[PDB]
Design an enzyme around this catalytic site. Structure first.
Site, PDB file in Angstrom:
ATOM      1  N   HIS B  41       0.802  -1.209   0.000  1.00 42.45           N
ATOM      2  CA  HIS B  41       0.000   0.000   0.000  1.00 42.45           C
ATOM      3  C   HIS B  41       0.845   1.275   0.000  1.00 42.45           C
ATOM      4  CE1 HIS B  41      -0.343  -0.069   4.647  1.00 42.45           C
ATOM      5  NE2 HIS B  41       0.227   1.066   4.284  1.00 42.45           N
ATOM      6  N   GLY B 143       2.633   6.107  10.591  1.00 42.25           N
ATOM      7  CA  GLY B 143       4.064   5.939  10.370  1.00 42.25           C
ATOM      8  C   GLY B 143       4.532   4.514  10.689  1.00 42.25           C
ATOM      9  N   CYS B 145       3.347   1.504   9.801  1.00 43.26           N
ATOM     10  CA  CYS B 145       3.172   0.407   8.862  1.00 43.26           C
ATOM     11  C   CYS B 145       4.538  -0.134   8.445  1.00 43.26           C
ATOM     12  CB  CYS B 145       2.374   0.823   7.625  1.00 43.26           C
ATOM     13  SG  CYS B 145       0.701   1.385   8.024  1.00 43.26           S
TER      14      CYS B 145
END
Ligand SMILES: O=C1C[C@@H](C(=O)NCCc2csc3ccccc23)c2ccc(F)cc2N1
Ligand SMILES: O=C1C[C@@H](C(=O)NCCc2csc3ccccc23)c2ccc(F)cc2N1
Ligand code: NA
Ligand code: NA
Ligand code: NA
EC number: 3.4.19.12
Lengths: 301, 306
Positions: B41, B143, B145
């Site tokens: 993503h 932040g 991920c």
């Protein structure tokens, strides 16, 4: 979002742990630059449990009586000295993995991470608070002495605890890295007992603010309190007094949530009176006192 | 003595964390050998996030669109490819700090350590369990991920989780390191919700054994039960079934403490029906289900990993 008991990453400390042997006793030590720090009681024999004369025991030792092992490597001890209740072993290699560091002595209520170690090797990492009675509620077996406690707030490691012993109630006592015990304890096997422990009130308030930041509102109420009337109620539940310092420290969490400190104090009074009645706060059925104001801000915003 | 929620030492994983930037998105990646792993993503914009065509977005990108920083050093991306919901960025340098490792997929009820990271920099470490509903109860900000979960079995790191998203209830979802989601989730911005969760029965029993080892014994009783009768009561309280395999795994703790599994099950039955009556176990007023049998044995026997 979410709220967890969270330790600092332990890698910077893992690279500093070594094994220290004197006679038949092995425990852990902390290798920084060219010094290894460990508990002085490593030099004691079975004879010397109750009333060791550390000055006398130490003068009898040579450098080559201390075996220090870092991984698969023996380091060469080239000097030895004692500072309060820690032994300092000068070695002939600076630790190439030495991080930026300093030694800090903490106050009751402060939190830190513990790297539990056996035979110089890391076992696990958890979070602790210095209790008001100057003990910590740790997880430590035989072999764990010299394990350290620390914070890392940027890239600098602050060492604040070294582990020395377990008391009869199963709680733990130790020193700063200058060898001064936290609380009235001594490194002797004479009978000693922790004072009755109390709840760290400022931390509980901090945790209530964390709950609000994470969307929990159920325990709030329309009341406020005076600081004095709060303290009178709180003491009856074995809570530490809340001082003006503590109120000031909570100012930023107060301003972020729109809930004045003395307003949140009244919420705490009610919780003590009523309990939780089947509810939880941040997944807990008891009030948590091992998160400081600084911890809450760091983990949340 | 003592019993704490305890994570694995995180150093071996700390040396693998890097920062990955694509456009205006920054998050974390895992650098092993000459590949950096991160959530696919990362390539999405806000418009794309509703209905992404990842294959299509990816083919439009060049190597130089991915900025990878390990500390203050830029790595050169020389290839990019996708495997399920993880992006693999080939880089021109093998990670000198790569530990012995494997990729494993864990089962619900298994625990692991999470190294929370921001901008490629490790910020904290905690222990989690994979819930029966395939969420984890994490603590994660924007932040985070690409933060990873892992176990250590020896000197071998087993990577089992990569963080992808937070669900509306404030719990967390992610993938294994082959990019397969745990649970029925997808990496897009649309309505998704955790299923109703259950309690991890075998882990609660494990924690009751930890309590006994630490001298907390008030909840023990003279009674025993059958696996069937226990399972009827457990189901009623939204507890996972206890299998024979679970009984077997508790065998060591049963023999060490003198409390057979079905004997401890009778303790657990009573606690569910009656509550704790003002008392606590290991300082907790609820039954803890995020310690496995292996966790309890490890912590009560002091296993290490140099
Ligand atoms: O946290 C621990 C470590 C260790 C410990 O408590 N104490 C170290 C000894 C010590 C204190 S003063 C003094 C003076 C001379 C010689 C030794 C000493 C321990 C042993 C057995 C056990 F079941 C648990 C634990 N727990
Ligand atoms: O755990 C977190 C991380 C992070 C998060 O969940 N990001 C999800 C992004 C995402 C998921 S699928 C998809 C497809 C395209 C583009 C973006 C995405 C977050 C941001 C803000 C906040 F308040 C909390 C959290 N919590
Ligand atoms: Na070591
Ligand atoms: Na109020
Ligand atoms: Na029983």
């Amino acid at each position: 979002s979410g709220f967890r008991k969270m330790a600092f990453p332990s890698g910077k400390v893992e690279g500093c742990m070594v094994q220290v042997t004197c006679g038949t006793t092995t425990l852990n030590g902390l290798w920084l630059d060219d010094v290894v720090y460990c508990p002085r009681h490593v030099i004691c024999t079975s004879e010397d449990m109750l009333n060791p004369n550390y000055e006398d025991l130490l003068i009898r030792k040579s450098n080559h009586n201390f075996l220090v092992q870092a991984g698969n490597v023996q380091l060469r001890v080239i000097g030895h000295s004692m500072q309060n209740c820690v032994l300092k072993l000068k070695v002939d290699t600076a630790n190439p993995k030495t991080p930026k560091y300093k030694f800090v002595r903490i106050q009751p209520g402060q939190t830190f991470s513990v790297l539990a170690c056996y035979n110089g090797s890391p076992s696990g990492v958890y979070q602790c608070a210095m209790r008001p009675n100057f003990t910590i509620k740790g997880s430590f077996l035989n072999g764990s002495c010299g394990s350290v406690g620390f914070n890392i707030d940027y890239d600098c490691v602050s060492f604040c605890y070294m582990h020395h012993m377990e008391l009869p109630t199963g709680v733990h006592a130790g020193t700063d890295l200058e060898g001064n015990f936290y609380g009235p304890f001594v490194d002797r096997q004479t009978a000693q007992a922790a004072g009755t422990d109390t709840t760290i009130t400022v931390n509980v308030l901090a945790w209530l603010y964390a709950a609000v930041i994470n969307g929990d509102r159920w325990f709030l109420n329309r009341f406020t309190t005076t600081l004095n009337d709060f303290n009178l109620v709180a003491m009856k539940y074995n809570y530490e007094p809340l001082t003006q310092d503590h109120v000031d420290i909570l100012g930023p969490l107060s301003a972020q949530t729109g809930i004045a400190v003395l307003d949140m104090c009244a919420s705490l009074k009610e919780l003590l009176q009523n309990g939780m009645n089947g509810r939880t706060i941040l997944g807990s059925a008891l009030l948590e006192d091992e998160f400081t104001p600084f911890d809450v801000v760091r983990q949340c915003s």
